[PDB]
RNA sequence: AAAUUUUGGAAGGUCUUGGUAGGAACGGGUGGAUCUUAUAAUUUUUGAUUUAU
RNA sequence: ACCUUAAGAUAUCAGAGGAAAGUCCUACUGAUCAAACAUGCGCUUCCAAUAGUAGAAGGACGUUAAGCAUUUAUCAUUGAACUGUUCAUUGAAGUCAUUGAUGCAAACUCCUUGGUCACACACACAUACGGCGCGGAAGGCGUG
């Protein structure tokens, strides 16, 4: 329908809180109309253990997607 | 089909930037400014007062208030009250828009001036300023103007006083300043 | 590279064990039919609230929203 | 076949709507929106006490019941008599219909019968 | 819908919105979409237990928003009036 | 005066939450199984309601379905107009219900000679069902008359519109 | 207050409602628009029962007195997903006759202004 | 460049890269294995699925994991 | 075109 | 056959739409509930809030919300060691379809 | 039934209550409400907030 | 410079007529429903002292007020004494508050709101109470 306005967050480090407790930081690579996001070089902030080279996050469990860069 | 309610122009159905283009132009940027000026102007101009419930005064309450005196009512003509209302509204607007910035002029030569008062190189709201004035750069050092008093600055502006009470001022100053 | 819809079509009259997400409750039985929303009907299914089996169940209709995974038993 | 259409046929009858919180609303039932957005009028909200000493109750339900504004200060149990509570559709869990009505005359889906005759 | 259009009209002004997790956010509203996704700028966040921090931007999914507090002056918006006149849209 | 009017409210005060955290929110887990009920409570339920109440609203549904399955085979159930081949014979359709055989013969003789005429009427009542069979002395004349009566907005029926065409036999 | 039996959410415009949420928080403000049933409230103040005083509502002085923490927040649009149920509390400031009067007033003014706008924009 | 999540899952399927799927909490389990196929709604079939609590879990075989529970799919 | 599911179909179907 | 079943619901025609609904109710997972209504055998429905109901279905629907009579709500409330078994009888009941988990047909 | 009553209508009297500048008919590549279907598949209504084992 | 569209419908059943089976329509006809507008009910609730300096409803994001009673203010590493306790050092986070928070209660001050209407300063009532002045607000019900 309407693609979310994330064309300015491309290839910039962001930190988004999975569900209500987890917080994942990575480099955004793409997104879908459901607000699914694929972010590379993830790191589960808590010491903090990396996730993998390429992860996808279902847009249902995303709450906020604040960006840790110039934007 | 969605139209702007300020411009009143009927816009072919859009949802993307087409609505971010219309709302970011000038016929929808200042024509939405004139609208809310008028609506806020009204709520300033409103003079309707609360409903008045008048109770029948009793004898004990009437006799004392009738004893004292009658009080004269001051009244103006139509043109005079027109002029007075215009003056009062203008004075209210002028005072409401007034902002005091003496502290900004006082610290004009501070060692860390360009990083705080310039308001474009600040760290909190500088991210907004960072197609469209001799701006003060952040790279200024205190070596520039080692001695501020070398005729560079000017005297502090004298304090303002109310004009309607301008005859209240003392006639002569204590000392003779040239 | 089989998709879930052809997979669930192929699982018809096959012993499958579907587990709900609540209490590791697992139903093991033959799959009779499926809907486009993956509603499942099981025949002669046995209930496993845990590793212990509770009993035998005649025919159960399982709502689509509860199943966590549908797996093919050997 | 949509049971919301059957539910729309009551329209003036006493129901007992039990929400998902646990609170049960009793009152005359007015029109029902096609999303099951019930509108009851002469209602008497109540909260079932679980009858077990150590199991206390829902708490958010008590908060909502009191904040409705109709709770009797001297009431021993949690009841709040008020008029016209509008209930959102997704909150209803089950609706206890009256005993007296006939189901055979109300359950006949006129639209489905019309479609079957037309086909 | 009227509330979505009101949130659209509320662009460029400081709004305060509380999520379903308990957090609170306030700041300039850059952009909003028809599905209640909002982008706040210079937001001052209050995590549920009371701690307050600051971030440059944020993009919160609309499915989690509880309510959004816009400036009070928007009560006089032209799209809140019921009887309206239309320009007779062309062919 | 650009944004001097849209002054927002003061920041909202903080109150300690009274609900459950987003991480702790869940519906009821440990939902006990359904197998235990079948052994004990089902026997009591079946013993105390032997038989269920009749399903009456399906009666009307299956009744109207019976009409559909009853109309078709009954219409299909079946097997003065047995004249010669229709190469020279003419046929008419959509004639009046209260018309007669002599009037139809005269109308057909208005634009072609008639050798044999026999109108077939419905068996229920002695009223002309709107069909009249007229044998013509010239197939070309009969075809021309039929074409004229079909192109001229239908032949003049007493209480209807009577279009004409081939017998199609 | 008494409210008409045949009164949907469209009739309760400028009534001062009592909107209840899933998390035990109520909102008390004037309804001015709706839609998914997500309202717009004018001056709604949010109330809640603190966990320290929740225990007084449980069944057992004779009359309960609950101190409810309330926050002031203005012209807020709710989301229909969280709304649980709505109750009515107070009537609008204006009577029904005065409401009809102002509606007729604004309709007359709008018709005249539209006629003048057409007359200006054509010629 | 931009790669959609659907294309990322397609790449996982094509290169058979093992993935560890995070089922969301109050379930407290993870699934490790290889993606054989995915759907519209993030429904995935998994071969050689391994059950891991949150490492003494039991293999499950080939399963179809409904997408309404998936939270992450990381390699 | 209705819910985003149809649009995602008209992407996944081409992807396969 | 396969094409019409897999075919997205926004391009089939009206007649084929209600034909699909009837086919889903006759040959499908809800055929269980349809049979249970038709031969009038009790069903044991396990709700989301740990409530088991034993009743006879009189009308069901796409979203699996059914009208039931002779309902007998059975549920247990527990805390620690203590347990109490409570039961409630309801004459005629409407039931929303978002709560049900598994619907068992009586043997 | 031409005497009586009840029911319907016409006219007149009395009392009251409301209105007083628009209204009817026709029309369309006219706006908005309501309803049905896509739509029970991650962004609102076909259940993860009765705090549980 | 970007944009040019989800599709349908507008009370409902039953009866008569017109274009075998539907199909459509009727300034056709019944019954039900819904809306508007008039119009009524011995309908129900509410509408503030002046014969006085009051009172009712709702607020205060008001004061007394640091009120009266409780309760809170980090984690890891290393050294030293010590029978857990005390002192120092490195690293890690860390909403402000402690005149706070929470529990209880009272006085005071002030805001908005209302028919501050008319006739009365009156011996009533068991069928318990002329609801037998004009308006207004809000609902319930009935008719056209």
């Amino acid at each position: 329908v309407s693609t979310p306005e994330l064309k300015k967050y491309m290839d910039k480090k962001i930190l988004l809180n999975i569900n209500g407790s987890r917080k994942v930081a990575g480099i955004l690579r793409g997104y879908d109309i459901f607000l699914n996001v694929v972010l590379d070089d993830a790191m589960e902030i808590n010491n903090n253990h990396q996730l993998g080279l390429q992860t996808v996050i279902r847009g249902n469990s995303i709450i906020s997607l604040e960006a840790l860069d110039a934007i | 089909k969605f139209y702007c309610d300020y411009c009143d122009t009927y816009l072919t159905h859009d949802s993307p930037s087409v609505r971010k283009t219309h709302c970011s132009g000038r016929k929808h940027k200042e024509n939405v400014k004139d609208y809310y000026r008028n609506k806020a102007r009204d709520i300033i101009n409103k003079h309707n007062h609360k409903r008045r419930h008048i109770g029948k005064r009793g004898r004990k309450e009437r006799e004392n208030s009738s004893q004292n005196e009658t009080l004269k009512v001051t009244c103006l003509s139509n043109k005079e009250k027109r002029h007075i209302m215009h003056v009062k509204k203008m004075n209210q607007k002028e005072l409401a828009q007034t902002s005091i910035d003496t502290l900004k002029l006082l610290y004009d030569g501070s060692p860390g001036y360009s990083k705080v008062f310039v308001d474009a190189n600040r760290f909190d709201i500088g991210d907004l300023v960072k197609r469209a004035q001799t701006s003060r750069s952040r790279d200024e050092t205190c070596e520039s103007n080692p001695f501020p008093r070398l005729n560079n600055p000017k005297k502090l502006e004298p304090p303002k006083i109310l004009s309607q009470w301008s005859n209240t001022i003392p006639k002569t100053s204590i000392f003779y300043s040239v | 590279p089989v998709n879930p819809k052809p997979f669930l079509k192929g699982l018809v009259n096959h012993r499958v064990g579907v587990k709900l997400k609540f209490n590791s409750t697992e139903y093991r039985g033959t799959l009779v039919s499926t809907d486009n929303y993956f509603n499942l009907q099981l025949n002669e299914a046995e209930e496993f609230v845990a590793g212990v089996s509770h009993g035998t169940l005649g025919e159960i209709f399982i709502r689509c929203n509860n199943v966590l995974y549908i797996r093919e038993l050997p | 076949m949509k049971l919301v259409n059957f539910l729309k046929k009551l329209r003036n009858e006493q129901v007992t709507i039990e929400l998902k919180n646990g609170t049960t609303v009793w009152g005359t039932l007015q029109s029902v929106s096609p999303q099951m957005n019930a509108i009851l009028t002469d209602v008497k909200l109540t909260l079932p006490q679980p009858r077990l000493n150590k199991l206390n109750s829902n708490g958010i339900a008590m908060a909502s019941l009191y904040l409705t504004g109709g709770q009797q200060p001297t009431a021993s149990d949690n009841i709040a008599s008020l008029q016209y509570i509008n209930i959102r559709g997704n909150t209803i869990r089950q609706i206890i219909l009256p005993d007296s009505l006939n189901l055979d005359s109300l359950l006949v889906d006129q639209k489905q019968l019309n479609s079957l005759r037309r086909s | 819908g009227i509330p979505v259009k009101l949130l659209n009209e509320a662009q460029g002004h400081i709004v305060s919105l509380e999520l379903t997790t308990g957090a609170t956010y306030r700041g300039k509203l850059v952009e909003s979409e028809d599905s209640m996704n909002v982008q706040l700028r210079d937001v001052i966040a209050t995590e549920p237990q009371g701690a307050v921090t600051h971030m440059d931007q944020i993009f919160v999914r609309g499915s989690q928003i509880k309510f959004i507090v816009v400036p009070d002056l928007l009560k006089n918006a032209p799209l809140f009036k019921k009887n309206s006149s239309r320009p007779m849209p062309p062919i | 005066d650009v944004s001097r009017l849209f002054k927002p409210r003061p920041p909202l005060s903080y109150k300690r939450p009274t609900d459950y955290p987003y991480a702790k929110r869940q519906t009821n887990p440990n939902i006990t199984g359904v197998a235990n009920l079948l052994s004990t409570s089902l026997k009591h339920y079946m013993e105390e309601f032997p038989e269920g109440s009749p399903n009456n609203h399906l009666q009307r549904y299956e009744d109207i379905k019976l009409s559909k399955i009853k109309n078709a085979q009954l219409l299909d159930r079946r097997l003065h107009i047995k004249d010669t081949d229709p190469y020279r014979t003419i046929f008419i359709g959509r004639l009046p219900y209260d018309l007669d055989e002599i009037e139809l013969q005269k109308y057909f003789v208005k634009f072609g000679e008639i050798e044999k005429i026999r109108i077939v009427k419905d068996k229920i009542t002695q009223k002309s069902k709107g069909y009249a069979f007229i044998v013509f002395k010239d197939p070309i004349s009969s075809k021309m008359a039929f074409k004229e009566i079909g192109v001229h907005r239908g032949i003049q029926i007493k209480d209807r519109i009577c279009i004409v065409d081939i017998e199609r036999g | 207050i008494q409210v008409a039996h045949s009164s949907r959410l469209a009739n309760l415009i400028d009534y001062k409602l009592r909107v209840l949420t899933q998390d035990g928080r109520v909102y008390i403000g004037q309804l001015m628009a709706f839609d998914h049933m997500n309202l717009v409230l004018n001056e709604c103040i949010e109330e809640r029962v603190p966990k320290t005083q929740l225990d007084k509502l449980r069944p057992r002085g004779t009359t309960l007195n609950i101190k409810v923490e309330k926050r002031v927040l203005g012209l807020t649009i709710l989301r229909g997903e969280q709304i649980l149920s709505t109750v009515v509390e107070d009537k609008p400031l204006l009577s029904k006759k005065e409401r009809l009067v102002r509606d007729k007033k604004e309709k007359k003014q709008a018709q005249k202004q539209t006629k003048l706008r057409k007359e200006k924009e054509k010629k | 460049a931009m790669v959609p999540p659907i294309n990322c899952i397609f790449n996982f399927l094509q290169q058979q890269t093992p993935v560890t799927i995070w089922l969301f909490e109050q379930i407290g389990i993870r699934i490790k294995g290889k993606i054989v196929g995915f759907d519209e709604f993030m429904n995935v079939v998994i071969d050689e699925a391994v059950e891991i609590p949150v490492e003494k879990g039991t293999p499950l075989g080939k399963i179809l994991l409904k997408g309404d529970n998936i939270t992450l799919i990381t390699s | 075109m209705s819910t985003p599911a149809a649009e995602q179909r008209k992407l996944v179907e081409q992807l396969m | 056959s396969s094409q019409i079943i897999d075919r997205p619901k926004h391009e089939l025609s009206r007649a084929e739409l209600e034909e699909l609904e009837e086919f889903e109710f006759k040959h499908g997972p809800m055929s269980l509930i349809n049979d249970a209504m038709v031969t009038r055998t009790p069903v044991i429905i396990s709700l989301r809030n740990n409530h088991k109901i034993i009743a006879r279905v009189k009308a069901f629907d796409r979203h699996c919300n059914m009208v039931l009579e002779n309902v007998k709500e059975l549920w247990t409330e527990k805390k620690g060691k203590n347990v109490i078994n409570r039961e409630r009888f309801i004459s005629k009941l409407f039931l929303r379809g978002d709560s049900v988990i598994v619907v068992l047909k009586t043997p």
Side-chain angles (χ1 to χ4, degrees), chain F residues 68-77 79:
Chain F
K68 204 67 78 153
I69 53 156
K70 159 45 214 89
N71 186 325
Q73 81 287 46
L74 267 283
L75 48 94
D76 163 38
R77 212 227 339 139
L79 75 132

Side-chain angles (χ1 to χ4, degrees), chain J residues 84-96:
Chain J
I84 176 85
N85 284 307
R86 302 212 30 201
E87 63 210 10
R88 177 177 55 170
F89 164 68
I90 308 169
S91 159
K92 306 210 200 82
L93 175 137
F94 182 92
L95 170 73
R96 197 181 173 86

